[PDB]
């Protein structure tokens, strides 16, 4: 052989774990950001950045710890350990905002490197990609909110933070500033999931609703064989069941795994497309029409503009606490209180 | 800084007990493919 | 080698050994720094 | 296939097709090539960062 | 103004009606 | 026959009319730029630039061609405000025309091709068959671009047979068209010195030159003409897509954040000029440098101009919004009439206290009055049982100094609540919202649109990237497996996975 | 905003059967989009290039 | 009440254009079998 | 030289000597020892 | 019959486990320390 | 709720997410049902 | 089918396995312990400890006010 | 310089279920964003 | 504390306890 | 520039609805003479 190909024959041999020559790019960035995240969760803090108490290390129970931004007075830079944020010396890095760029950009870098991967078996077994094509709804959601929504706006302390709770915080967030849900961007995408999840649930229990007696015991999936060509469910009576109850019917067996790619994959694209205005916050919050009469006419009485001074409840009320980079003390009688509560 | 040197110790006896109950097998899986 | 010992009598001290450890962090919420106690 | 006074000023532009240059040929002068290429890119998004800023730079809006 | 959603409504609703009576009929071959 | 998502696939073959399927797409976008700024000159008002400017009127193109040295409009209404005189045949009503006529010569000669194919031109000589080399013509392409931003380079912006792109001070004030210099040196490296954008394509030109010199005269590698898949059109065209969404990323950024191939002028304040109070840090300079001189605050706060308090206000900056916010920004405000001054508040004692409030993704924020170090001393009382901090038991006056309306004060307090949420919005402005039937909530410039429609756009390119370059690699495979392979799936079989020899 | 009311008036995402509600529909978004894909992906040739690949078979 | 002024010339234009296409595609296909 | 630069001088050495040649060492002086076999 | 003892999933499986339980007697102790 | 969870040993409220949470969780329950709420407990 | 190396109900069936996992994984559980009680993720992540917050003359939860220089500003924070 | 015909051009088949499929999507586009066009 | 570790006593003895019944029939040879 | 504020949705319905039912018609055709 020459000199590259003994390393071609290395890389795609079958061990276990299949190791990939664009694994390389994967296994360093994969195993750090999730080890990366896994310290920020535990050890290494805010509470220099923006007043929080979020690691296990100050006590908080997983459900509100997180790693989680830089600060808001600090730009869009990206913490190196190495740079002017810094200079090694991490100890200082670390609580200096700092980590999560460590593993945002390692997050980014290893969804290259998965998507690299499945492009890179799927030649080797020549099998035609959809799943790196499936990937795009993963990979766009991504590098549009963790990526693409913080530099559109100031510096990433306004981008998610990682944890369960700091992603909780980015909801609420994205409720009162820029009214995230009646965007129709938005709106496409819980049509994507939604429509995702019956679809993968409707097709999951009329292959288990018809199936074809090769066994004689009584558990089904016993005596299936994987080298059998004669089809497991019956796609006659399944199309006979859902043309009488529903009375729309999928007619032939391909296209409805092409069906259950597709709907959750432009599910995620079309609200991909939506944090990018959100990003540069062409919110569509308001409405043109049905707030001059939510002005000159208190007769006009709709859920819109119900709805619209509720995100005026969030956005003087937890705006001191959730950003103390300005310092916004508020006097308490300021605040937007409906009544004795 | 003597507290680093008292959390290593367990890292120390980690592998120390990697040397002396398997390693006798690992030269000769070191000798393996002819280097 | 011959010393083999049924998976099944392992697979209990593994698992108890999983629980007590995640037994012992829901005994760590009730006392401790964030019990607010 | 017809000849025009176009098509014959250009189809020795078009003559061959599939000549190939031999054995893994000059890959690495395109890889040592790509190489500068990122380390330039990467020091370009750290002028326009500040986090290699240099002496006399101060990118800011006080400029020409 | 108003009378744009009840066009492109009933027109959604009159699509629903329309693949129930003509649908391609599957026939096994 | 194919479905409707590929029907394009029948120019995927023969090259002969793919000339002539770009070349309607050419002409119907430069059948496009001149079909929009002729309309985008028919509602301009050239009567006020420095009220309403000309990123004021939602105009998205005409800084594009107004940013390379185009003033002459036609008719004697300069855009920088010297037009001298008859512009000559490259005024806006003129670049707008030929792009009109360019792509009717370009539609002409579209249909051209698509009647007439097999030129003599699109096939090998070893068979009959339509394929056409692209290496050698990558070296024939990118050599002609090389020229012309050397071209671009030199002969355009440095003055040479051309004149110079747009350049302005900072905090823009007199922006006009001056040849710029191209500065060599490390400085050019920073996207606000113009000085790099005349040095850019003579050095990325030159060796945009000494690539396809190059170019033309080597051959591909095997090891890469069998792994790239040279030979098919649809690699390169993933190449391209996926080449184009990079360069789509900068120009999202670089419109966004700002440079100096992105003035103030004919894009507006750039959005973080609230997040450091970038223009308030120069009109609160230049009126304590007249008091350093020794002027009274009455009659200085009038040499600043009314465009510094122009890009002080929250409806240029182009945070605000919306999606749905349809039209021009003056759609939002209406025309700007006059700047009224600058409010300033007073207690009953003084204790001087002000308003620097409105940061930019907020849409109320709640008004509140403080002093120096940040105590609050007023605000609006929104429960009015416990209020200690109320306009009214303190009795708060407003000093406005400068502008329309100078020297007027303002005792009541029914009054100071109007010019509070003025002091807001950084400095206030007089407007008319009956002209346009302008409503009254905010829009966005034209740099906050394109940056929405060329990040969107640059996202929806990626997966046109991913999917171009599934179908290059995996062309064989495309209409499905062969059938069984089940030894090559199958594990421990010999010996490394796609391997035929074990 | 019944939504934003049940987040104030009694604390919705803080709970776990919420939380294992969004695993099984996250879950279910992916596993229509992974068992979906690769039935997709693993189809077998039937076809030519020219028509759709979702042809070259007769339904049962 | 307040409108756009424009929309029903835009939400006019979305809904039909395209149908229209689609409905330009299917009579294309379906007319081709019949045995002329 | 500038306290800015140098301290991205320093990666780039870094960067280098820890992660590309152990990885390039650690590939090819492994793949070499362990050759395939192509006789059958 | 003999299988090797080190592999590329000797490597595989001891990372991400040698700080798994290195952190789960990180976390073990946290809670029996009190402020 | 995790809220006033974590404490220094004065007894000072450190701030989580929990209460960041709550903080948003504070307004909108200050806020629905504007005007039937005349005794402070949201409790019906 | 087979891959080439041991199957792991094949590992920890041999008894080899637990000679090296009596010693070790208890040995690695006590260094996770000594991380934390000797405080050393405290000096050396930068976690404050709980009662080093607040200072006598800080109360003022402690945030990043200028990105530039960044690092004489915790030591003024302490 | 002379004329001649095509060795190609395939005609599209779009199926009368795949007509349902694009009515109601353009029509589930309608109904979303025309309250957004107002 | 005293009878702390004693109600950990009584969770340890009781939990391994369970088991016990099992590998005790599962090597004596009782039909499980 | 005072103006019927409804004329261009009516003289956009006037030449489109039935042009595109004459260019509805035309491909039908086509697809007959192509016999198909
Ligand atoms: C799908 C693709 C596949 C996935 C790929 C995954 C791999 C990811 C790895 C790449 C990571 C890129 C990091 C980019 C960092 C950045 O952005 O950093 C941001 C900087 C800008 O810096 C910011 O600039 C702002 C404006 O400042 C200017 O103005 C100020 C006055 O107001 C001051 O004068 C200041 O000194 C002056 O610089 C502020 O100052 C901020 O504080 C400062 O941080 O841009 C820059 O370096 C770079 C700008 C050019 C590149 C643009 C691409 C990245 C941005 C996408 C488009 C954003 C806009 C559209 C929204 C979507
Ligand atoms: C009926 C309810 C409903 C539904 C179904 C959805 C549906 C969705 N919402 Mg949504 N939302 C809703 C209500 C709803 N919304 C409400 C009421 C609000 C409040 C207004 C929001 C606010 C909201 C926000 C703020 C955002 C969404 C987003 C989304 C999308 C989810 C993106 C996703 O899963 O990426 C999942 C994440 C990834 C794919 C990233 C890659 C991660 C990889 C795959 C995992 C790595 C694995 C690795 C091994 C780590 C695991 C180990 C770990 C445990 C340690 C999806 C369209 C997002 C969106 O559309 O943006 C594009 C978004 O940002 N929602
Ligand atoms: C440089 C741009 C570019 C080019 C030249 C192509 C070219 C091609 N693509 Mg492709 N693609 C691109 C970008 C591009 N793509 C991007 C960015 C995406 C991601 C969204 C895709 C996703 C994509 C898919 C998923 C598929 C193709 C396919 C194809 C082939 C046939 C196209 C066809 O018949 O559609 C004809 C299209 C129509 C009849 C109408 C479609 C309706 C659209 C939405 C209307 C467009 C709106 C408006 C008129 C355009 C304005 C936007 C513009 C300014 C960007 C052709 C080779 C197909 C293929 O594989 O064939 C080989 C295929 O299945 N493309
Ligand atoms: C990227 C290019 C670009 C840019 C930034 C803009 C931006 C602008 N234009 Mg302009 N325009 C463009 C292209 C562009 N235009 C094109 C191509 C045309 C020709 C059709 C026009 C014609 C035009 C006119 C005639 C006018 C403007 C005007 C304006 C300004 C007012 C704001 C506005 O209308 O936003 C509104 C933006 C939206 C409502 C967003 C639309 C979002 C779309 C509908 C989403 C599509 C989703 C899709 C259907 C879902 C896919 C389906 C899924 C299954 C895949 C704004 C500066 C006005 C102005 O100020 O001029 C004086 C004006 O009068 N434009
Ligand atoms: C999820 C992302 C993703 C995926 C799956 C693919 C997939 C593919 N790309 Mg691709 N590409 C991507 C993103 C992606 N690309 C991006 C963001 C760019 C830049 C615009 C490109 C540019 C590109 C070109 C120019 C070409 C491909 C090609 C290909 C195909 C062959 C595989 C290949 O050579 O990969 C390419 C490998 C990568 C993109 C991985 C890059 C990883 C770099 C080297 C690591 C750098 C790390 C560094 C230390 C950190 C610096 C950043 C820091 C400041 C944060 C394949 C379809 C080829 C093609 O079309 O096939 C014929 C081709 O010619 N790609
Ligand atoms: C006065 C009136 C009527 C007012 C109503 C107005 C109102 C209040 C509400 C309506 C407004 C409305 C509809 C808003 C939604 C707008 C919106 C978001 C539209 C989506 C548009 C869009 C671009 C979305 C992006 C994502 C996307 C493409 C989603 C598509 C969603 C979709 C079609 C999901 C399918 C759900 C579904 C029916 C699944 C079942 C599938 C099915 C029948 C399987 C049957 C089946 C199963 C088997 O297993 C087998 C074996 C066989 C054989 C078989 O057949
Ligand atoms: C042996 C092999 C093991 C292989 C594991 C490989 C890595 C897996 C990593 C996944 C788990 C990540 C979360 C870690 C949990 C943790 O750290 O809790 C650690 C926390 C910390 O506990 C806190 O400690 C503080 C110390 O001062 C305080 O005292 C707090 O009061 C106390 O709660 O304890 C808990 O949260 C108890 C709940 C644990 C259950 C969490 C399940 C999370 C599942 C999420 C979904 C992922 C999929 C998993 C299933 C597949
Ligand atoms: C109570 C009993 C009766 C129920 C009444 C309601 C039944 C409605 C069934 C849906 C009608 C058909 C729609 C698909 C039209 C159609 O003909 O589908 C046909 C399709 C099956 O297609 P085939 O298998 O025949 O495809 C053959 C291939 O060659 C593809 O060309 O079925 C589906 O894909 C189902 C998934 C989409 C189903 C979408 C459901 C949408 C629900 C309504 C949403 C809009 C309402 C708007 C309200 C404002
Ligand atoms: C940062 C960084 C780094 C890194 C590090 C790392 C990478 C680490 C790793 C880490 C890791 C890698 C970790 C891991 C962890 C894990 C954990 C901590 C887990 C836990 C878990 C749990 C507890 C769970 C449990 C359970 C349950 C609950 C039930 C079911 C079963 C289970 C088991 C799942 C270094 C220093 C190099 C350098 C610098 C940078
Ligand atoms: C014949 C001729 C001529 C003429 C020419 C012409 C007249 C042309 C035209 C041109 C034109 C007239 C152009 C324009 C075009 C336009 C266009 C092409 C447009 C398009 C549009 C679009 C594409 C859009 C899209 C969209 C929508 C729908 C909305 C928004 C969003 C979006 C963007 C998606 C002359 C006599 C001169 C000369 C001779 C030849
Ligand atoms: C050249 C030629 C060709 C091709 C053809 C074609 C196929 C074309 C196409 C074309 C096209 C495809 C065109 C398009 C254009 C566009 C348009 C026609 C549109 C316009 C639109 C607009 C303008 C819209 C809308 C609106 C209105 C009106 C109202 C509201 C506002 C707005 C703006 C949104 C060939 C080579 C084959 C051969 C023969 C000749
Ligand atoms: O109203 Mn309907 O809502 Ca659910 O919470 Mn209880 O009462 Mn009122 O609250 Mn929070
Ligand atoms: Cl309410
Ligand atoms: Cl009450
Ligand atoms: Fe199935």
Same mark, same amino acid.
């Given at each position: 052989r020459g000199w590259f190909d003994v390393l071609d024959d290395w890389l795609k041999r079958?061990?276990?774990?299949?190791?990939?020559?664009?694994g390389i790019l994967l296994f360093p960035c994969a195993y750090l950001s999730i080890g990366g995240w896994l310290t920020g969760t535990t050890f290494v803090t805010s509470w220099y950045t923006h007043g929080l108490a979020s690691s296990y290390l100050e006590?908080?129970?997983?459900?509100?710890a997180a790693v989680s931004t830089p600060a808001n007075?600090?730009?869009?830079?990206?913490?190196?350990?190495?740079?002017?944020?810094?200079?090694?010396?991490?100890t200082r890095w670390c609580q200096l905002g700092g980590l999560w760029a460590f593993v945002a950009l390692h997050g980014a870098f290893a969804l290259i490197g998965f998507c690299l991967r499945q492009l890179e078996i799927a030649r080797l077994v020549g099998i035609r990609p959809y799943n790196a094509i499936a990937f795009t709804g993963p990979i766009a959601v991504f590098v549009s909110v963790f990526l693409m929504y913080p530099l559109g706006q100031?510096?990433?302390?306004?981008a998610p933070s990682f944890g369960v709770a700091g992603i909780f915080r980015f909801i609420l967030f994205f409720q009162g500033?820029?009214?995230?849900?009646?965007?129709?961007f938005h709106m496409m995408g819980v049509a994507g999931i939604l429509g995702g999840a019956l679809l993968c649930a409707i097709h999951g229990a009329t292959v288990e609703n018809t199936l074809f007696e090769?066994?004689?015991?009584?558990?089904?999936?016993?005596?299936?064989?994987?080298?059998?060509?004669?089809?497991?469910?019956?796609m006659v009576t399944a199309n006979r069941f859902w043309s009488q109850i529903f009375?729309?019917?999928?007619?032939?067996?391909?296209w409805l795994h092409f069906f259950m790619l597709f709907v959750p994959v432009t599910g995620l694209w079309m609200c991909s497309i939506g944090v990018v205005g959100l990003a540069v916050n062409?919110?569509?919050?308001?409405?043109?029409?049905?707030?001059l009469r939510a002005a000159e006419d208190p007769?006009?009485?709709?859920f819109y503009t119900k709805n619209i001074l509720l995100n005026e409840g969030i956005r003087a009320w937890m705006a001191p606490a959730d950003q103390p980079h300005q310092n916004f003390?508020?006097?308490?009688?300021?605040l937007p209180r409906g009544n004795a509560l | 800084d003597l507290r680093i040197v008292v959390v290593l110790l367990p890292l120390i006896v980690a592998g120390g007990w990697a040397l002396f109950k398997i390693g006798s097998a690992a030269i000769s899986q070191a000798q393996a493919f002819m280097k | 080698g011959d010393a083999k010992l049924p998976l099944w009598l392992i697979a209990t001290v593994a698992g108890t050994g999983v629980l007590v450890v995640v037994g012992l962090f829901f005994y760590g919420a009730y006392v401790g720094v964030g019990s607010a106690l | 296939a017809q000849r025009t006074w176009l098509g014959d000023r250009l189809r020795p532009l078009?003559?061959?097709?599939?000549?190939v240059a031999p054995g893994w040929g000059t890959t690495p002068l395109m890889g040592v090539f790509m190489g500068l290429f990122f380390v330039f890119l990467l020091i370009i998004l750290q002028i326009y960062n500040s986090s290699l800023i240099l002496e006399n730079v101060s990118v800011d809006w006080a400029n020409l | 103004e108003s009378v744009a959603y009840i066009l492109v409504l009933t027109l959604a609703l009159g699509v629903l009606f329309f693949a129930i009576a003509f649908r391609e009929p599957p026939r096994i071959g | 026959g194919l479905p409707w998502y590929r029907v394009?696939?029948?120019?995927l073959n023969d090259p002969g009319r793919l000339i002539s399927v770009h070349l309607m797409h050419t002409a119907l976008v430069a059948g496009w730029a001149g079909s929009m700024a002729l309309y985008e000159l028919?509602?301009?008002? %050239?009567?006020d630039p420095v009220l309403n400017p000309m990123w004021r009127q939602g105009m998205f193109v005409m800084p594009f061609m107004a940013?390379?040295?185009?003033?002459?409009?036609?008719?004697?209404?300069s855009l920088t405000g010297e037009?001298?005189?008859?512009?000559? *045949?490259?005024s806006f009503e003129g670049v707008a025309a030929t792009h009109i006529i360019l792509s009717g010569l370009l539609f002409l000669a579209a249909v051209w091709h698509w009647v007439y194919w097999?030129?003599?031109?699109?096939?090998?000589?070893?068979?009959?068959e339509p394929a056409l080399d692209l290496p050698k013509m990558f070296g024939i392409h990118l050599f002609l671009s090389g020229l012309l931003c050397f071209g671009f380079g030199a002969?355009?912006?440095?003055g040479l047979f051309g004149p110079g792109m747009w350049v302005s001070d900072p905090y823009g004030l007199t922006g006009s068209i001056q040849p710029v210099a191209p500065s060599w040196?490390?400085?050019?490296?920073? %996207?606000?010195?113009?000085g790099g954008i005349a040095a850019h394509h003579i050095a990325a030109g030159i060796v945009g030159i000494i690539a396809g010199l190059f170019h033309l005269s080597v051959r591909p590698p095997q090891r890469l003409y069998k792994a790239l898949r040279?030979?098919? *059109?649809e690699t390169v065209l993933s190449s391209s897509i996926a080449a184009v969404f990079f360069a789509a990323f900068v120009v999202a950024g670089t419109m966004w954040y700002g440079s100096a191939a992105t003035? *103030?002028?004919?894009?507006?304040?750039?959005?973080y000029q609230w997040d450091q109070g970038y223009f308030q840090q120069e009109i609160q300079r230049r009126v304590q440098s007249s008091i350093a001189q020794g002027d009274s605050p009455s009659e200085?706060?009038?040499? *600043?101009p009314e465009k510094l308090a122009f890009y002080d206000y929250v409806g240029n900056? %182009?945070?605000?919004?919306?999606?749905?916010?349809?039209? %021009?920004?003056n759609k939002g405000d209406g025309i700007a009439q006059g700047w009224l001054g600058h409010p300033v508040f007073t207690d009953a004692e003084g204790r001087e206290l002000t308003v620097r409030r409105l940061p930019n993704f907020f849409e109320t924020f709640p008004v509140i009055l403080t002093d120096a170090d940040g105590v609050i001393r007023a605000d609006i009382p929104?429960?009015?049982?416990?209020?200690?901090?109320?306009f009214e038991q303190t009795g708060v006056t407003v000093?406005?100094?400068?502008?329309?309306?100078?020297?007027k004060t303002f005792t009541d307090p029914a009054s100071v609540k109007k010019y509070a949420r003025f002091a807001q919005q950084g400095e206030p402005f007089a407007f008319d919202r009956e002209t346009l039937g302008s409503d009254g909530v905010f829009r966005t410039s034209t740099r906050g649109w394109f940056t929405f429609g060329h990040a969107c756009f640059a996202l929806l390119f990626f997966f046109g990237h991913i999917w171009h370059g599934s179908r290059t690699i995996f062309r064989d495979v495309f209409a499905g497996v062969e059938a069984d392979l089940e030894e090559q799936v199958e594990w421990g079989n010999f010996q490394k996975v796609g391997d035929q020899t074990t | 905003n019944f939504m934003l009311v049940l987040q104030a008036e009694?604390?919705?995402?803080?709970?776990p059967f919420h939380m294992l509600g969004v695993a099984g529909v996250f879950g279910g978004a992916l596993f229509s989009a992974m068992h979906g894909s690769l039935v997709t992906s693993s189809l077998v040739r039937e076809?030519?290039?020219?028509?759709?690949?979702?042809?070259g078979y007769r339904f049962g | 009440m307040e409108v756009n002024d424009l929309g029903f010339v835009a939400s006019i234009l979305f809904v039909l254009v395209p149908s229209v296409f689609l409905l330009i595609l299917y009579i294309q296909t379906q007319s081709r079998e019949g045995k002329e | 030289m500038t306290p800015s630069l140098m301290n991205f001088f320093y990666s780039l050495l870094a960067g280098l000597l820890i992660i590309v040649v152990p990885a390039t060492v650690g590939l090819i002086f492994i793949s070499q020892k362990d050759k395939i076999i192509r006789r059958s | 019959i003999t299988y090797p003892i080190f592999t590329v999933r000797w490597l595989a499986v001891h990372t991400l486990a040698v700080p798994t339980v290195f952190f789960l007697g990180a976390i073990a102790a946290m809670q029996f320390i009190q402020r | 709720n995790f809220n006033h969870s974590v404490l220094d040993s004065q007894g000072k409220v450190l701030n989580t997410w929990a209460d960041v949470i709550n903080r948003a969780n504070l307004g909108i329950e200050a806020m629905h049902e504007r005007n039937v709420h005349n005794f402070p407990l949201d409790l019906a | 089918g087979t891959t080439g190396e041991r199957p792991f109900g094949d590992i920890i069936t041999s008894v080899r396995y637990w000679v090296i996992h009596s010693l070790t994984i208890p040995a690695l559980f006590i260094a996770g312990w000594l991380f934390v009680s000797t405080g050393l993720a405290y000096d050396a992540f930068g976690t404050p400890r709980p009662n080093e917050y607040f200072t006598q003359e800080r109360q003022e939860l402690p945030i990043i006010t200028?990105?530039?220089?960044?690092?004489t500003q915790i030591q003024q924070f302490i | 310089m002379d004329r001649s015909r095509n060795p190609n051009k395939q005609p599209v088949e779009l199926n009368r279920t795949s007509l349902y499929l694009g009515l109601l999507l353009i029509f589930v586009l309608g109904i979303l964003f025309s309250s957004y066009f107002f | 504390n005293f009878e702390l570790i004693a109600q950990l006593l009584m969770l340890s003895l009781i939990v391994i306890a369970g088991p016990v019944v099992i590998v005790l029939l599962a090597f004596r040879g009782g039909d499980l």
């Open positions: 079958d061990r276990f774990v299949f190791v990939g020559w664009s006590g908080c129970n997983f459900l509100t007075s600090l730009g869009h830079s990206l913490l190196f350990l190495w740079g002017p944020e810094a200079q090694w010396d991490f100031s510096g990433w302390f306004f500033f820029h009214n995230w849900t009646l965007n129709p090769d066994g004689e015991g009584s558990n089904t999936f016993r005596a299936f064989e994987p080298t059998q060509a004669e089809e497991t469910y019956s009375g729309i019917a999928f007619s032939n067996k391909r062409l919110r569509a919050y308001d409405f043109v029409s049905q707030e007769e006009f009485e709709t003390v508020f006097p308490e009688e300021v | - | - | 078009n003559s061959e097709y599939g000549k | - | 394009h696939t029948v120019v028919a509602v301009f008002d %050239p009567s940013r390379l040295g185009v003033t002459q409009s036609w008719g004697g209404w037009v001298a005189d008859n512009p000559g *045949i490259w097999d030129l003599e031109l699109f096939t090998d000589p070893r068979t009959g002969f355009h912006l440095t040196g490390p400085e050019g490296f920073n %996207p606000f010195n113009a040279m030979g098919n *059109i003035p *103030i002028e004919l894009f507006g304040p750039t959005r200085a706060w009038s040499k *600043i900056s %182009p945070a605000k919004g919306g999606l749905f916010r349809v039209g %021009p920004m929104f429960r009015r049982a416990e209020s200690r901090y109320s000093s406005l100094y400068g502008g329309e309306l100078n020297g | 009694h604390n919705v995402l803080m709970h076809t030519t290039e020219i028509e759709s690949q979702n042809r | - | - | - | - | 200028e990105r530039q220089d960044s690092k | - | -």
